[PDB]
Design a protein around this ligand. Sequence first.
Ligand code: HEM
Length: 151
Amino acid sequence: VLSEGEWQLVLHVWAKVEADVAGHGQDILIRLFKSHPETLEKFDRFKHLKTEAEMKASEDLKKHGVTVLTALGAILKKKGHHEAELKPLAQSHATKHKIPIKYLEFISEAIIHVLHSRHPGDFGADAQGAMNKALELFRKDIAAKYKELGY
Ligand code: HEM
């Protein structure tokens, strides 16, 4: 459980993300696919983009960066009272996209990496720990929905 103070660190960082949501999202997807190439295979739409240079050039990941980060932002803004926002996403990722929890761990590493890269002097130890606690709660809660569904 996060404190209100930690939630405020999380949401203050999120406002930075929102100043360039497509670029942050593109960067996170590139990191995910470059660091864990098996993840790219889950995306039939994007799996032609096998090099970092192709990924970075693609209008596809800029647009998709908005999709993923807007959804994550909406969940973060619920400060863990996020069951309703989280549920449809868990369902879609278990059944339709078939995404293991390990892959959500991979994208969580990519999020922290990019936040650090893009905000080197304004994403410190406290903000990074708080964001890690928020992402852990997100993953825990998706894992609980996965268990309920039998995925
Ligand atoms: C922060 C974690 C994530 C968030 C917030 C998120 C959110 C979303 C959203 C909002 C959509 C569009 C609606 C839908 O089809 O459900 C989506 C689609 C999808 N997600 Fe995720 N996702 C996350 C992580 C992942 C990961 C780690 C993978 C795979 C390694 C993945 C695979 C997919 C796939 C394959 C689609 C369909 C993409 C398309 O063809 O349009 N997601 N996700």
